[PDB]
Amino acid sequence: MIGLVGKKVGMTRIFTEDGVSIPVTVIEVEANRVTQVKDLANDGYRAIQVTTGAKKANRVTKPEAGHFAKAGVEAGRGLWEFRLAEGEEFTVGQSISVELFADVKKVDVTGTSKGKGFAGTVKRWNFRTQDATHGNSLSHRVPGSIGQNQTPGKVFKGKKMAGQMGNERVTVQSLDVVRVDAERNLLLVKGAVPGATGSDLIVKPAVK
């Protein structure tokens, strides 16, 4: 099935009457507006495109404005796409709300992780440190050996080394749906999700 686009608000807890505390992530999901329908005859596959949010007039270029005006919807802050299954139909200009998850039980959430910058092997790959005493000489966190002798005479492809860590696309699977609130546009899920407060999230029904 299709999914929705939302924003990360924060984390809190829910108390039950038995005396259990459930940690929850709070996701705000406003209405998603359909901008384009793609079919087999003209594009080669079946999908929909959606927008959400709001944008200021003097930041919208003429190409984008014309694209929005063809569909007849107000400008939003981005464009995303979802693939269709057999038997699903939508029309241009339609609005989809968070009531779509009323009976779903588990979801998958996709986002962009926090950025650590240039990282070493100890933090990036969980390497072990060498001795801090007993005569070590300037080699406490360094990586160690990286190959063999004359045979093969090179370094293999895919070796683990220091570099940039984080700031990439990540998916977390099979989270329980804890609450759906349609009057305040809220979805509450159990556990932690990638990203920082205020970033964008993509939510779909669980694939497994």
Partner: protein, 123 residues
Amino acid sequence: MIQEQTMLNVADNSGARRVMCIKVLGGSHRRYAGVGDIIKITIKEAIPRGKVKKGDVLKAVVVRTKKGVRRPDGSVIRFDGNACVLLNNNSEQPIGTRIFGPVTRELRSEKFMKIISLAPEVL
């Protein structure tokens, strides 16, 4: 959080005073033991005319720790020391006839009901 070389006090009247942990049973490469887990020990100090001697090798279960236990609402319970109860190597049943100090409800299983029933308080 009990590992190898850790010293513990004894919460029963079987004769031992101080014991040392020599293995954490379970699976391969296992690090820690907590309340409710079974370990292998050696005896380092005992009173004169008890039921055990200094240097024996037996089993034991952990009943109190300085790190504590969490509960399903987020609460904690912590103690001031580390204590255990001595078990028989083959049967795995207690060796003494009395229990000293409080214990917790993690022990409420079919295996340790004698300890639960002999304890003076269950928190």
